[PDB]
Write a protein that holds these residues in place. Sequence first.
Motif, PDB file in Angstrom:
ATOM      1  N   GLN A 184       0.822  -1.206   0.000  1.00 16.01           N
ATOM      2  CA  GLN A 184       0.000   0.000   0.000  1.00 16.01           C
ATOM      3  C   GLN A 184       0.857   1.259   0.000  1.00 16.01           C
ATOM      4  N   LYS A 185       1.971   1.244   0.734  1.00 16.23           N
ATOM      5  CA  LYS A 185       2.799   2.442   0.848  1.00 16.23           C
ATOM      6  C   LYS A 185       3.351   2.869  -0.506  1.00 16.23           C
ATOM      7  N   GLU A 186       3.847   1.917  -1.297  1.00 19.10           N
ATOM      8  CA  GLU A 186       4.385   2.269  -2.608  1.00 19.10           C
ATOM      9  C   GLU A 186       3.276   2.678  -3.567  1.00 19.10           C
ATOM     10  N   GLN A 187       2.097   2.063  -3.446  1.00 18.93           N
ATOM     11  CA  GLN A 187       0.977   2.449  -4.297  1.00 18.93           C
ATOM     12  C   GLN A 187       0.529   3.874  -4.002  1.00 18.93           C
ATOM     13  N   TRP A 188       0.436   4.230  -2.721  1.00 20.24           N
ATOM     14  CA  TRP A 188       0.080   5.598  -2.358  1.00 20.24           C
ATOM     15  C   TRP A 188       1.177   6.577  -2.755  1.00 20.24           C
ATOM     16  N   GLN A 189       2.440   6.200  -2.546  1.00 19.51           N
ATOM     17  CA  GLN A 189       3.545   7.084  -2.900  1.00 19.51           C
ATOM     18  C   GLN A 189       3.604   7.337  -4.400  1.00 19.51           C
ATOM     19  N   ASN A 190       3.205   6.352  -5.208  1.00 18.97           N
ATOM     20  CA  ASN A 190       3.216   6.533  -6.656  1.00 18.97           C
ATOM     21  C   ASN A 190       2.231   7.612  -7.087  1.00 18.97           C
ATOM     22  N   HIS A 191       1.017   7.597  -6.531  1.00 25.03           N
ATOM     23  CA  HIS A 191       0.041   8.631  -6.858  1.00 25.03           C
ATOM     24  C   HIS A 191       0.500   9.997  -6.368  1.00 25.03           C
ATOM     25  N   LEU A 192       1.054  10.053  -5.156  1.00 27.64           N
ATOM     26  CA  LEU A 192       1.475  11.328  -4.586  1.00 27.64           C
ATOM     27  C   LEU A 192       2.606  11.961  -5.383  1.00 27.64           C
ATOM     28  N   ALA A 193       3.543  11.153  -5.883  1.00 25.85           N
ATOM     29  CA  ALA A 193       4.630  11.693  -6.688  1.00 25.85           C
ATOM     30  C   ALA A 193       4.161  12.152  -8.060  1.00 25.85           C
ATOM     31  N   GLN A 194       3.049  11.608  -8.557  1.00 26.20           N
ATOM     32  CA  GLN A 194       2.530  12.028  -9.854  1.00 26.20           C
ATOM     33  C   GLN A 194       1.886  13.406  -9.780  1.00 26.20           C
ATOM     34  N   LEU A 195       1.205  13.704  -8.672  1.00 27.70           N
ATOM     35  CA  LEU A 195       0.598  15.020  -8.508  1.00 27.70           C
ATOM     36  C   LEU A 195       1.656  16.114  -8.462  1.00 27.70           C
ATOM     37  N   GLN A 196       2.805  15.827  -7.844  1.00 27.05           N
ATOM     38  CA  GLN A 196       3.865  16.824  -7.743  1.00 27.05           C
ATOM     39  C   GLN A 196       4.379  17.245  -9.113  1.00 27.05           C
ATOM     40  N   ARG A 197       4.330  16.345 -10.097  1.00 31.93           N
ATOM     41  CA  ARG A 197       4.803  16.683 -11.435  1.00 31.93           C
ATOM     42  C   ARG A 197       3.929  17.753 -12.076  1.00 31.93           C
ATOM     43  N   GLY A 198       2.611  17.607 -11.968  1.00 31.26           N
ATOM     44  CA  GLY A 198       1.681  18.528 -12.583  1.00 31.26           C
ATOM     45  C   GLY A 198       1.378  19.778 -11.796  1.00 31.26           C
ATOM     46  N   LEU A 199       2.014  19.960 -10.638  1.00 31.59           N
ATOM     47  CA  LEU A 199       1.744  21.133  -9.817  1.00 31.59           C
ATOM     48  C   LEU A 199       2.196  22.422 -10.486  1.00 31.59           C
ATOM     49  N   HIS A 200       3.205  22.360 -11.359  1.00 28.82           N
ATOM     50  CA  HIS A 200       3.672  23.557 -12.050  1.00 28.82           C
ATOM     51  C   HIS A 200       2.589  24.174 -12.921  1.00 28.82           C
ATOM     52  N   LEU A 201       1.562  23.403 -13.275  1.00 27.03           N
ATOM     53  CA  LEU A 201       0.477  23.895 -14.112  1.00 27.03           C
ATOM     54  C   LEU A 201      -0.415  24.895 -13.389  1.00 27.03           C
ATOM     55  N   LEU A 202      -0.321  24.988 -12.064  1.00 24.72           N
ATOM     56  CA  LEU A 202      -1.150  25.895 -11.278  1.00 24.72           C
ATOM     57  C   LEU A 202      -0.450  27.211 -10.966  1.00 24.72           C
ATOM     58  N   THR A 203       0.818  27.157 -10.552  1.00 22.49           N
ATOM     59  CA  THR A 203       1.575  28.345 -10.180  1.00 22.49           C
ATOM     60  C   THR A 203       2.362  28.933 -11.345  1.00 22.49           C
ATOM     61  N   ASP A 204       1.925  28.693 -12.576  1.00 22.28           N
ATOM     62  CA  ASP A 204       2.652  29.144 -13.750  1.00 22.28           C
ATOM     63  C   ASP A 204       2.208  30.543 -14.163  1.00 22.28           C
ATOM     64  N   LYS A 205       2.989  31.147 -15.054  1.00 22.24           N
ATOM     65  CA  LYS A 205       2.717  32.483 -15.571  1.00 22.24           C
ATOM     66  C   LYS A 205       2.474  32.513 -17.071  1.00 22.24           C
ATOM     67  N   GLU A 206       3.185  31.693 -17.841  1.00 22.47           N
ATOM     68  CA  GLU A 206       3.006  31.641 -19.284  1.00 22.47           C
ATOM     69  C   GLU A 206       3.281  30.225 -19.761  1.00 22.47           C
ATOM     70  N   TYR A 207       2.637  29.840 -20.857  1.00 18.83           N
ATOM     71  CA  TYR A 207       2.820  28.497 -21.388  1.00 18.83           C
ATOM     72  C   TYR A 207       4.221  28.335 -21.958  1.00 18.83           C
ATOM     73  N   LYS A 208       5.000  27.438 -21.358  1.00 16.13           N
ATOM     74  CA  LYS A 208       6.310  27.090 -21.884  1.00 16.13           C
ATOM     75  C   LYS A 208       6.183  25.799 -22.676  1.00 16.13           C
TER      76      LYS A 208
END
Lengths: 86, 80
Positions: free
Chosen positions: B56-80
Motif C-alpha cells: 500500500q505504501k508504494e501504491q500511495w507514494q506513486n500517486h502522490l509523486a505524480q501530482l507533484q509533477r503537474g503542480l507547475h500547471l497551477l503556479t505558472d505564468k506563461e505556457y512554456k
Amino acid sequence: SVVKSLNSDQDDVKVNIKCLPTIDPTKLPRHEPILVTVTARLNKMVSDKLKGYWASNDYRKQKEQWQNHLAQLQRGLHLLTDKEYK
Amino acid sequence: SVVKSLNSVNIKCLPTIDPTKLPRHEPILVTVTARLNKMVSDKLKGYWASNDYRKQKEQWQNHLAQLQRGLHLLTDKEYK
C-alpha cells in the motif's frame, strides 16, 4: 555436498549454519575486492529474508537499522583501494 | 462542534482550515494534500501485515509523486 547438508537442516538444534553461495576467485571480475563480493552475496540472503517477514513493525525496524550499516561501510570503502592519502 | 461530533457509514474529517492563516501564495490543493498525507501516513504505521504495508505504501507514494509533477500547471505564468 556439505552445503546441501547445512542449508537443508531440519531445524533440530538452536545453533545453525547459513551458507553463502560458492565464490570462485577465477571467474570473479578483476579489480574487485573480495569484501565487496561477499557483502553483495550476503545482501541477497538478508534482503530476501527481510522480505519474508510477516510482522510489519518488525520488518520496518530491521530494514532501517540494516540499511544504516551498509551506508557506513561504503563511506569507508574508499580507504581500501587508494594510491594516496588526502 | 460538527467536526468533533463526527469523530465519535464512516466519515473521516480533516482538520479545519481557514484561508486567512495561510501563506498568501500557497494554493489550496497543496494545503489539502499535505493534511491528507499526514492522516494516511499515520494509518500505515498502524498496520500489522508486512505484505500489505509494503504494497500500500508504494501504491500511495506513486500517486502522490505524480501530482507533484503537474503542480507547475497551477503556479505558472506563461505556457512554456
